[PDB]
Every structure is written in structure tokens, then in C-alpha cells.
Symmetry: C3
Subunit: 104 residues, 3 copies
């Protein structure tokens, strides 16, 4: 489906992916014109597995391309490739300008 | 209540807990059959003075939420100020990178 | 706000040197417990910090404003603020949920 629940104007696409696929996902997202990915280091299972959380907040009508493009850049075929979560976002505000909603 | 607003198929459970309680929360969740926990380092400023905490993140179905909450409390509670908080956030969809499977699949 | 919720997470992706200003400004409006982490923007990266705070619905506007005050420089790269609905808040120590759990009760 595409009418995600809860309904929202904006969504966070949160990807937990391999650390070495950072640029591959970033580049692929650039090829569809989406900029402004935020990246942070996380770890799954003192034994851990190093992962990278990639966040980008987008309009509802962009979510499917983003998902597909992250998969494209993140998939290696092996177990440990990660997951992608789609979370509703009520509002986006640009700090510099104070612009809310679509103007942000 | 169990009917959380906003209503969703999945929910993210976010636990900000003491760093030395990582293994205990991880294992307690393991005993109820839950894996896929991811952890990151956070700093609580609530000089450059902070308290070191860890954020523990898991995404589960709506019917798993209460079991996850209680199991994190069990793994993380010491009884002293600074045990942390748990946040429950709606998640619209979950997608496995390797396979493309969405929803419950 | 859509979706409607009792609580909202306010995530602020801002400059690393703006922690104290954002922090202090929030304390003046009665928000004591901000959570901070290292994040990177776009091998070259831009260093930023994610500041996370969960508040009641009626506090969100005031929290957006206060963060802007502490974080705005006027320069390109001031960051963005995201508002996400939070279904429930639980205090680990006591098991308290809802309003009797939102306030940060740690030492200063």
C-alpha cells in the first residue's frame, strides 16, 4: 500500500544499514534529487555489530522512491543487510528561516 | 490502554537507559523471543557537563508493545534516579533490505 | 498536528556548538531534560547534533521557538527540526506512564 497509517504529510525514512554502504545509498538518493541525509553510528548484537542509521524526512509521495533507492544502495544479498522504518512526521521546521511544512 | 493514539501496525520502542544495563535489557528481550535491538550512545544534559546514557531501539508489532515495555523495565530498573525513560512511537511500515519484504512479511 | 497525539518528540538537527544555548533556553521555559547525539550530514561530512525532547502537545510550539532562539546563526547549515508523535512515555524507575512520566527528574 501507499496510504500509510497514521496519515501524515511527512515521514521519516529510517534505515539501519551496513557502514560501508553509506556512500552507495547517499549517491543513489542524489540521483533522484534527494539531499540532506543524516547519518549516525549504531550497533546491534560486550560483542556488537557496527551499523549506520540513515535518516531523511520526506513528503508522503516520496517515500516509495526513497525506500527503493536505499534498498538499491544498501542490498548486498547477505544476512545483516538491515531494515527500513517509515515513521510519521507532524512537522518540519527550517532553523535558519523558520519555514514550516513544504517551504522547508 | 493498549489502543495507542496514533493507531499503527508497528511501533518503535525507544529506551534511554544506563549504559551498563545494555546486556540485561538485551537478554531479557531475548528470553521473550525479541531480537533486532539497536543501541547508540546519547548524552544527557538533562562547563560541558553530561550524563552518558544509551538509546535502545526496537520496532515491533502493536501486540508486542506491552511485553517489550515491561521487559525493558525489568532489564533496566535499578530503582535509583537516572534509570531513564521509554518512548513509544508509531511506525507506518517496516522493510527488510535484503529481501524487500514489508508489513509482517 | 497530524497525526493527533498526547505527546510529541521534537528532534533538532543543529550545529554542535549550539548545545548550551539551546539547552539553557529550554530550561527557562521549564524543559530540563534534553538528549543529545552525534550525527553527520552530507569522504567528507558535516558534523551536527541531534537534540531530542518529548513534550506534551500544548508545549510543541513553544519548544520549536526556544530551540530556534538557541540554535539560529543566520548561516546556511543551521539545521532542521522534526516533530514526531509519541504514543506513550514511561518512567523506567517507577513504571509511571503518561503525564506523571514526561518530566525529567534527574539531578542537575
Amino acid at each position: 500500500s501507499s496510504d500509510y497509517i497514521p496519515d501524515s504529510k511527512f515521514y521519516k525514512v529510517e534505515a539501519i544499514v551496513r557502514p560501508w554502504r553509506i556512500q552507495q545509498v547517499s549517491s543513489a538518493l542524489l540521483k533522484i534529487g534527494i539531499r540532506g541525509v543524516t547519518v549516525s553510528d549504531v550497533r546491534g548484537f560486550d560483542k556488537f555489530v557496527a551499523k549506520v542509521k540513515m535518516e531523511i524526512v520526506v513528503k508522503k509521495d516520496q517515500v516509495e522512491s526513497v525506500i527503493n533507492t536505499i534498498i538499491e544502495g544498501a542490498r548486498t544479498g547477505e544476512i545483516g543487510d538491515g531494515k527500513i522504518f517509515v515513521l510519521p512526521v507532524s512537522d518540519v521546521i527550517r532553523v535558519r528561516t523558520g519555514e514550516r511544512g513544504e517551504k522547508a
